[PDB]
Amino acid sequence: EQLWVTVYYGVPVWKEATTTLFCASQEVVLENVTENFNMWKNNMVEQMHEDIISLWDQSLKPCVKLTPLCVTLNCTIKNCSFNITTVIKDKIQKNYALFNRLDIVPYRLISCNTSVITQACPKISFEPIPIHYCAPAGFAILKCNDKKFNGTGPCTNVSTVQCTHGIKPVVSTQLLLNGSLAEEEVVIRSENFTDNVKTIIVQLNESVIINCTRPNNNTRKSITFGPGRAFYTTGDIIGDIRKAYCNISSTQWNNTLRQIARRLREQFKDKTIVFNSSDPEIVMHSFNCGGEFFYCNTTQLFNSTTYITLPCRIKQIINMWQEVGKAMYAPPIAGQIRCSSNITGILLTREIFRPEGGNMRDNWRSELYKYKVVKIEPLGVAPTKCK
Amino acid sequence: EQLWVTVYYGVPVWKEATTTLFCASQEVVLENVTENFNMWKNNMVEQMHEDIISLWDQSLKPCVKLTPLCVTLNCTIKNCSFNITTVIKDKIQKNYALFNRLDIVPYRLISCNTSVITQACPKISFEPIPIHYCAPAGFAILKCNDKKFNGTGPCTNVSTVQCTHGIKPVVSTQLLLNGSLAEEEVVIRSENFTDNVKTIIVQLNESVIINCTRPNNNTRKSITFGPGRAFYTTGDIIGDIRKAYCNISSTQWNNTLRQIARRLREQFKDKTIVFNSSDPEIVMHSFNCGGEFFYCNTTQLFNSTTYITLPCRIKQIINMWQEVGKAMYAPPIAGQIRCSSNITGILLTREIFRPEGGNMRDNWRSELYKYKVVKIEPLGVAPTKCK
Amino acid sequence: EQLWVTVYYGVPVWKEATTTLFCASQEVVLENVTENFNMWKNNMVEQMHEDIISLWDQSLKPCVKLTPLCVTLNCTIKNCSFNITTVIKDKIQKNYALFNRLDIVPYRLISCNTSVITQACPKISFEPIPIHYCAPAGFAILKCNDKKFNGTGPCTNVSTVQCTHGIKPVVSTQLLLNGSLAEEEVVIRSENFTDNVKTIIVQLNESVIINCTRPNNNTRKSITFGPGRAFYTTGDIIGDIRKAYCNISSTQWNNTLRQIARRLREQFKDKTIVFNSSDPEIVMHSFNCGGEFFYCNTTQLFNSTTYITLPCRIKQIINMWQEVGKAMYAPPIAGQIRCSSNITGILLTREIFRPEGGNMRDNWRSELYKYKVVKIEPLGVAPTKCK
Amino acid sequence: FLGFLGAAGSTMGAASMTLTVQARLLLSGIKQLQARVLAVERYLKDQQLLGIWGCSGKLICCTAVPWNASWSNRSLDNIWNNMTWMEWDREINNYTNLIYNLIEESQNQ
Amino acid sequence: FLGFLGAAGSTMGAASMTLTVQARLLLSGIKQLQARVLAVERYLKDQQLLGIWGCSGKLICCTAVPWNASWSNRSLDNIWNNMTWMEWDREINNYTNLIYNLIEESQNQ
Amino acid sequence: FLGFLGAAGSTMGAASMTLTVQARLLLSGIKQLQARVLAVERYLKDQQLLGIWGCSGKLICCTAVPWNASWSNRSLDNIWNNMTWMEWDREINNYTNLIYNLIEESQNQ
Ligand SMILES: *[C@@H]1O[C@H](CO)[C@@H](O[C@@H]2O[C@H](CO)[C@@H](O[C@@H]3O[C@H](CO)[C@@H](O)[C@H](O)[C@@H]3O)[C@H](O)[C@H]2NC(C)=O)[C@H](O)[C@H]1NC(C)=O
Ligand SMILES: *[C@@H]1O[C@H](CO)[C@@H](O[C@@H]2O[C@H](CO)[C@@H](O[C@@H]3O[C@H](CO)[C@@H](O)[C@H](O)[C@@H]3O)[C@H](O)[C@H]2NC(C)=O)[C@H](O)[C@H]1NC(C)=O
Ligand SMILES: *[C@@H]1O[C@H](CO)[C@@H](O[C@@H]2O[C@H](CO)[C@@H](O)[C@H](O)[C@H]2NC(C)=O)[C@H](O)[C@H]1NC(C)=O
Ligand SMILES: *[C@@H]1O[C@H](CO)[C@@H](O[C@@H]2O[C@H](CO)[C@@H](O)[C@H](O)[C@H]2NC(C)=O)[C@H](O)[C@H]1NC(C)=O
Ligand SMILES: *[C@@H]1O[C@H](CO)[C@@H](O[C@@H]2O[C@H](CO)[C@@H](O)[C@H](O)[C@H]2NC(C)=O)[C@H](O)[C@H]1NC(C)=O
Ligand SMILES: *[C@@H]1O[C@H](CO)[C@@H](O[C@@H]2O[C@H](CO)[C@@H](O)[C@H](O)[C@H]2NC(C)=O)[C@H](O)[C@H]1NC(C)=O
Ligand SMILES: *[C@@H]1O[C@H](CO)[C@@H](O[C@@H]2O[C@H](CO)[C@@H](O)[C@H](O)[C@H]2NC(C)=O)[C@H](O)[C@H]1NC(C)=O
Ligand SMILES: *[C@@H]1O[C@H](CO)[C@@H](O[C@@H]2O[C@H](CO)[C@@H](O)[C@H](O)[C@H]2NC(C)=O)[C@H](O)[C@H]1NC(C)=O
Ligand SMILES: *[C@@H]1O[C@H](CO)[C@@H](O[C@@H]2O[C@H](CO)[C@@H](O)[C@H](O)[C@H]2NC(C)=O)[C@H](O)[C@H]1NC(C)=O
Ligand SMILES: *[C@@H]1O[C@H](CO)[C@@H](O[C@@H]2O[C@H](CO)[C@@H](O)[C@H](O)[C@H]2NC(C)=O)[C@H](O)[C@H]1NC(C)=O
Ligand SMILES: *[C@@H]1O[C@H](CO)[C@@H](O[C@@H]2O[C@H](CO)[C@@H](O)[C@H](O)[C@H]2NC(C)=O)[C@H](O)[C@H]1NC(C)=O
Ligand SMILES: *[C@@H]1O[C@H](CO)[C@@H](O[C@@H]2O[C@H](CO)[C@@H](O)[C@H](O)[C@H]2NC(C)=O)[C@H](O)[C@H]1NC(C)=O
Ligand SMILES: *[C@@H]1O[C@H](CO)[C@@H](O[C@@H]2O[C@H](CO)[C@@H](O)[C@H](O)[C@H]2NC(C)=O)[C@H](O)[C@H]1NC(C)=O
Ligand SMILES: *[C@@H]1O[C@H](CO)[C@@H](O[C@@H]2O[C@H](CO)[C@@H](O)[C@H](O)[C@H]2NC(C)=O)[C@H](O)[C@H]1NC(C)=O
Ligand SMILES: *[C@@H]1O[C@H](CO)[C@@H](O[C@@H]2O[C@H](CO)[C@@H](O)[C@H](O)[C@H]2NC(C)=O)[C@H](O)[C@H]1NC(C)=O
Ligand SMILES: *[C@@H]1O[C@H](CO)[C@@H](O[C@@H]2O[C@H](CO)[C@@H](O)[C@H](O)[C@H]2NC(C)=O)[C@H](O)[C@H]1NC(C)=O
Ligand SMILES: *[C@@H]1O[C@H](CO)[C@@H](O[C@@H]2O[C@H](CO)[C@@H](O)[C@H](O)[C@H]2NC(C)=O)[C@H](O)[C@H]1NC(C)=O
Ligand SMILES: *[C@@H]1O[C@H](CO)[C@@H](O)[C@H](O)[C@H]1NC(C)=O
Ligand SMILES: *[C@@H]1O[C@H](CO)[C@@H](O)[C@H](O)[C@H]1NC(C)=O
Ligand SMILES: *[C@@H]1O[C@H](CO)[C@@H](O)[C@H](O)[C@H]1NC(C)=O
């Protein structure tokens, strides 16, 4: 018999594509399907990084620039004094302000000649809030529910989700804080573990709690430039002068480090491995805690084959993501600062392994490893006996 | 006897929703329907308020700042002389300027230590044009046609219009000008009359005409203070120096106050009421007349248990809608300025009653009190005897 | 007998349009159809001019302004010196720079008195690239393929194209550079030959090669005024100095003028045609060669009834379209530069004939004379016998 | 000619003859961008939801889905002669998704 | 065969078999958000103007409105075998809105 | 009810009963303007391509395009009871435009 062409609308097939995901702040299982995933070719990570750059640029656009503070400072933390113009242009008034050591260079501010300093707007905050990346109509976001997932490879338990979970945009350099933990084992994923250039991402099945503090009791002082331009800075400290530190329980870190070493030995050949030490922005552990930007020295943790106290520095002028042509002055926070977080992931780089990485893109690649964006193609053709 | 499902399109039902009403610059009577209204929870007021602020901020964006003003003014209305830089950077010229008294604080401009002063472009015009708010396809605007509607509660007669009437964005603090008169009587309406903090909106059925004038013959002069940057100031006055005043007929105002008292005593308990007098933006009557922002002392209108002359002052630096950082230098206008207006409504605040009009959203609640936006839902199902 | 109206969709008819085309960087013959064309009321010229002005203004937005250069200069091409501030705002220092004669007036800069000088950003370049204009969906672009087309009137060979040919947005005043050559013969076209006001566009069938060079060996120097605001200028010249000039073959230009005079004698009456010489913006040949804006005297070419050498000057500060208060500082290039270009067209004005081309829309009328945009109207009605 | 939405207070026995003047107004082509995209999306959503069910080209259509008494058990004289469309929308509001799912399933047969 | 808009010079009888190549390319696929929304709105305007009259899913439809000789009165073979579509669009250009309103009125019944 | 894309692993006979589950969720209305405009255009392009071929609003329709064994020589029970739509699309990805223009040619002929 002859066979004739039919057309079907609503065919359940998909093809790979890139779309314009939007932020937002159901799940069905897909049986008998073996869609393959790849964590190192995701467009969602690039789109998330571009959106974070676009959001950080837009918040610092309208408010005050710190051009008139590129003056000579008579510094004696440090106590410094300078000449500055008051709101009347003809009059010049002497003032004073405390500065941290990393903000000043022999004094003057550290980022005068490099780029222009735009002060952060005095009411904004850097508290991370969860962001769900969601796909428009006609697209779908797949998820791989395999427990032993390694990144590049085919999945056996694929599911279509409405959109992603609560990805918190936490900024960190070496230890990934407040992330999502693995289900069964400590999992190490790399694009090529036999290459020295490629970074190594570790995910911990059990978190390590970290406590950090700034015991100096600062107070906030305001300095006026002219019409409608102000500047907030520390005036004095009411109390004893102390350093800022972070505490990690040593037994938890030792057990976690033993598990990392065991699984990393299992991935590599049967050889001994040692953990070694790592510009303060790429060497030290950089994160924000309560509004202040800490820079903590992590050479005590990675020194292997009660508590551990890590000394830290506070920095107010930051120029992260290496954008030449922009800088940022975070306003100081009055009172004591205390915060706690869970260590979830560590970024390693090649016997000898050391924490390394100035890219902030690998922080979000450890959250978006389960997901993939597809495009629905509902039209289909098939032969039927008679039409 | 079996009932099977019937699908209808074009079913006349609606549900409450908030939409994006677009500006533009027909009524059908709905029978046997009762719809509740609430003008304090109306979302058209917030939409109009945000649109007017966005239009003002769009107008003040490219029209250049006034820095390097705020130099030390030496003043003898006032005659002030100051030193300013010329178009060449390293040279200083001497200029003189006539400024009003309210623009000057002990000299120095009034908005120097609070906000950046963006000068207003000489093309600009503050004349109100009527704006009709229209609803898109799928949405509808319901109008309450009760002649004694008190703002809340159900409305017996409801009608549907495509767009609102000619709402004029008149900015005025204490006395509403060029508004919509009531149908039958003077109507006093409020959210609840027992709370003293809530504003009281009075709407008159007979308008009271007001005549305001600026009898000084001012001349305008251009001062250039930079490369391609200049601004306009009053040069000199020709003729006798006179004050700006507004004229109200005393018989009309006495009858208006007696009607307001007569209708207002019907709400409160049996008690005599007295009108008492009320930072010039909130204390005295501030309004625009011919391009100059008059500030008229209204203690004679509200002092009770031929013509009435109210003295007025002129300001050129205003910072409307209470937002810090957005002041505007209004350019002066040469020649005598005269305007006439119709007094439509008075805003009151608690017996003793004094005018208080600090917010600008109560100017537009007196126009958008009839209207309500709904979302039409055309689909519907019902059982019949088909098939 | 009896006819009924029927509806057809996809009917090939079109009407006039004024839509906004989109840039980009198939053809159907259309037998048996005639369409009238008009290059003087063609709307693509205004669209191209608005887009070119918008991109040229957008490219000059983020980078540095030269307000601090507006200071007196103690000059000895001139060697000038001035005083600016350092990167530190407190102290000042003395620098020197080499400026051309056309950029200074008796010494201050050319446009500090009226305009705002903005430096062209060092990342961008002035090299033109081909630009294709494509009609949006629902519209079509018609092209007249007649070789005898005189600019307005009916066209016999009309064809539909998706996008226009590659048009380079070159900058020229008197001689059209790198344009589209005529098909078989030198063609003159104008709006009204008997009108003195209307310009005259001449197109050539064979091009004339022009060679221009800058024999001075300039060296780039960097100058800073503060945080992140740099400035580039010539520091010194290595070797002997020599003027810039352009070379044109004399016999080829003489034959070109003979053919042009023949066609002007055909269009006008049989009489004597004489060419005469033509503010450096409109008198001299203003064009770009290797990144520097040349201004060449053209009185040798247009004086008639081995090579020829035209002297040229160099401007660093230009103002395209003569915008009110906005100009541009082009950063100088280091070392010698040479360039070569085709001469494909001359703009003339009326017998005596003098070249003047100060408007840049007549530059682009020579490239969009073949094109016309239309709007497809796919619906149509026609009677048919069947019900 | 009652006009647009003028049969809202009438009973649904008499309001069902007036569906043309409500249907003819909900059209396109006659903060601008949000309103235009919203109008286009609402028109296309109504047309797609009407076209999956069958009867894309008419205002009154009726399917093979049997009416369940759990949704509403009142008689036809109570439905079509005693109530307006607002009240009937208020009764079966939580059962609209189940009815729409049943219509979509029955049309696929 | 003749490509997009290639039968503009041919007669109606030749060009009536090739309506798809003008019908297909009215969508996109070849700031720019506004022109793109404008293209969608123009296509939807033509589509629902067709859909009000009936025959939403076909390119050639037949209506019940009788042809009036005041609009045009020449012979049928001259219209359908000798004349291009543009010349016919020129002739009945004063009566297209009236024919559209009569077609809209007849579909209402 | 297997939900959206729930029958993607089911056979072509079984997955043909869940066409309305997928087809209901191609259109929006469930910074952000690009996503909504893109969804509207993808749905509108698919609907236009379906309506050009004919029979957009009904199920049973005649197509009259013969099937070529060079496209797929597989027996019909093996097509409709053994494989899914994904590998069918993989088999007929390159041959699809020929089938599309043959359906368009059979529409007018
Ligand atoms: C993080 O903390 C560690 C430990 O506090 C820092 O390591 C310390 O680095 C300094 C300078 O590199 C070492 O000083 C050196 O001492 C040797 C004698 O041992 C002397 O010969 C050298 O001339 C120099 O003075 C110091 O010994 C070393 N601490 C330890 C325990 O070895 C590290 O620098 C910190 N990280 C950063 C980024 O600053
Ligand atoms: C972070 O960890 C460090 C070290 O584990 C903690 O430092 C410890 O703090 C306690 C209480 O402040 C100290 O106890 C005190 O010792 C003095 C003698 O020096 C005694 O006179 C007091 O009565 C009291 O017992 C303890 O000595 C100190 N340990 C070290 C090695 O210095 C720190 O408190 C932790 N911080 C946080 C926020 O958890
Ligand atoms: C495949 O993934 C699914 C994920 O849905 C697992 O099934 C359960 O799904 C429910 C749905 O809400 C979850 O709440 C459960 O946590 C899931 N797991 C369990 C154990 O119930 C399913 O188990 C996975 N199968 C395999 C073999 O990994
Ligand atoms: C990881 O990268 C290394 C880079 O050295 C790859 O090793 C080489 O791959 C090339 C390409 O086929 C071979 O010709 C060489 O013989 C390989 N070895 C060396 C020592 O150069 C390696 O294949 C990569 N691994 C993965 C899984 O991609
Ligand atoms: C940190 O410094 C602040 C600023 O002096 C302290 O706050 C003061 O505390 C005293 C004692 O209770 C009060 O009398 C003052 O009124 C407080 N000042 C303000 C501005 O509130 C604070 O107590 C200090 N904290 C510590 C732990 O030393
Ligand atoms: C970080 O600080 C928290 C308190 O904010 C610590 O939690 C306390 O831990 C002690 C000792 O384990 C317990 O006795 C308390 O009951 C805990 N209190 C709370 C509120 O949890 C935590 O231990 C600190 N982390 C480290 C590593 O020391
Ligand atoms: C406006 O007038 C209406 C009556 O037209 C008031 O509504 C009444 O409010 C009282 C107090 O809650 C109720 O007991 C009555 O049943 C309501 N009547 C109706 C018909 O709903 C309404 O309260 C008035 N608004 C104000 C602010 O006073
Ligand atoms: C505004 O009202 C005042 C009344 O206070 C008017 O002033 C009077 O004008 C008449 C006519 O010129 C004089 O005879 C009176 O002597 C004035 N009264 C006083 C107290 O001076 C004034 O003319 C009115 N102005 C306008 C424009 O109507
Ligand atoms: C407010 O009203 C009172 C009473 O009407 C005014 O007081 C009168 O002022 C006049 C003018 O000086 C006197 O001749 C009367 O004797 C006063 N009467 C009383 C009872 O005091 C008062 O002047 C008014 N205030 C203003 C600003 O107009
Ligand atoms: C511009 O610079 C020149 C130097 O290049 C200045 O000329 C010197 O002036 C001083 C004081 O008048 C003399 O002592 C030197 O002998 C001059 N040198 C030369 C080479 O002439 C000149 O004065 C400067 N112009 C101004 C206005 O200051
Ligand atoms: C009318 O214009 C068309 C182009 O729009 C001409 O067709 C071209 O003819 C040349 C020479 O025969 C071919 O090389 C090209 O390939 C043709 N173009 C296309 C798109 O087919 C045509 O010759 C012109 N006719 C006249 C009489 O001038
Ligand atoms: C071209 O220019 C000529 C004059 O140079 C125009 O001719 C004049 O047109 C005006 C307006 O119609 C008449 O009043 C004059 O009498 C005309 N003068 C002559 C000498 O004819 C002519 O209209 C312009 N346009 C065209 C298309 O030729
Ligand atoms: C272009 O070159 C000619 C060369 O002759 C210049 O004309 C001379 O200009 C100077 C200065 O104004 C006069 O003294 C001569 O008498 C002129 N000679 C002639 C023959 O006219 C002309 O000025 C130059 N044009 C420009 C813009 O540089
Ligand atoms: C314009 O052209 C005329 C004609 O060629 C030039 O006049 C000649 O100039 C040369 C140079 O001095 C003399 O030797 C000839 O005798 C002149 N001939 C005549 C007829 O006068 C004139 O110089 C040219 N002008 C410019 C500015 O280039
Ligand atoms: C441009 O034209 C000039 C002539 O105006 C050429 O200059 C000649 O160059 C040759 C070789 O260098 C010399 O022998 C001649 O004496 C020069 N003539 C004159 C009048 O000076 C020059 O070569 C041409 N080309 C370039 C690239 O400049
Ligand atoms: C105009 O000048 C250009 C170069 O500036 C000439 O273009 C080159 O000419 C040679 C010789 O025919 C070709 O081999 C090259 O392919 C051409 N380059 C390009 C990019 O097309 C051109 O010949 C000159 N003449 C005309 C009439 O354009
Ligand atoms: C996924 O594949 C499995 C394995 O074939 C399916 O399970 C059985 O499939 C056969 C083939 O039709 C049926 O006869 C059995 O009845 C199925 N088992 C059960 C328990 O029903 C399974 O149905 C497939 N999943 C989907 C969603 O199609
Ligand atoms: C009516 O609905 C109830 C509850 O949803 C269900 O149990 C019953 O089977 C339904 N009746 C029919 C005939 O579908
Ligand atoms: C035909 O058109 C004319 C236009 O004047 C009109 O008067 C006449 O009634 C029309 N005839 C029919 C049958 O509609
Ligand atoms: C089937 O396709 C082949 C090529 O794939 C072609 O040669 C053959 O003619 C086609 N069959 C028919 C009946 O056209």
Author numbering:
A (entry chain B), B (entry chain A), C (entry chain C): 32 to 56, 82 to 132, 154 to 183, 191 to 330, 332 to 363, 367 to 393, 410 to 416, 419 to 456, ...
D (entry chain a), E (entry chain c), F (entry chain b): 519 to 548, 574 to 652
Can you list sentences taken from the study reporting this PDB entry?
Interaction of HIV-1 envelope glycoproteins (Envs) with the cellular CD4 receptor and CCR5/CXCR4 coreceptor mediates virus entry into target cells. HIV-1 Env trimers of most primary isolates prefer to adopt a metastable closed, pre-fusion conformation and transition, either spontaneously or in response to CD4 binding, to downstream conformations. Subsequent engagement of the Env-CD4 complex with the CCR5 or CXCR4 coreceptor moves the Envs down the energy gradient on the entry pathway, culminating in the formation of a gp41 six-helix bundle that facilitates the fusion of viral and cellular membranes. HIV-1 envelope glycoproteins (Envs) of most primary HIV-1 strains exist in closed conformation and infrequently sample open states, limiting access to internal epitopes.
We solve the cryo-EM structure of an unliganded, incompletely closed T/F (1059) SOSIP Env and identify structural determinants of protomer flexibility and increased sampling of incompletely closed states. To gain insights into the structural features of the incompletely closed Envs identified in this screen, we determined cryo-EM structures of 1059-SOSIP, and for comparison, of the well-characterized BG505-SOSIP. Both the 1059- and BG505-SOSIP trimers were purified using Galanthus nivalis lectin (GNL) chromatography, which exploits lectin binding to Env surface glycans in a conformation-independent manner, followed by size-exclusion chromatography (SEC). We obtained cryo-EM reconstructions of unliganded 1059-SOSIP, resolved at 3.6 Å with 737,588 particles, and of BG505-SOSIP resolved at 3.7 Å with 975,399 particles. Analysis of the unliganded 1059-SOSIP sub-classes revealed three structural characteristics of the incompletely closed Envs: 1. conformational flexibility 2. asymmetry and 3. partial opening of trimer apex. Within these 10 subclasses, we observed a larger range of protomer motion in 1059-SOSIP compared with the limited range of motion observed in BG505-SOSIP. Further, 3D variability analysis of 1059-SOSIP captured scissoring motion of the protomers, and partial opening of the trimer characterized by outward motion of V1/V2 loop from the trimer apex. Overall, the 1059-SOSIP cryo-EM analysis reveals occupancy of a wider range of protomer conformations contributing to augmented outward motion of the V1/V2 loop at the trimer apex and higher asymmetry of the Env trimer, compared to BG505-SOSIP. HIV-11059 Env resists VRC01 neutralization despite strong binding of soluble monomeric 1059 gp120 to VRC01, suggesting interference with access of VRC01 to its binding site on the native Envs on HIV-11059 virions. Trimer asymmetry, increased conformational flexibility, and scissoring motions provide the long-sought structural evidence for putative “breathing” ability of HIV-1 Envs.
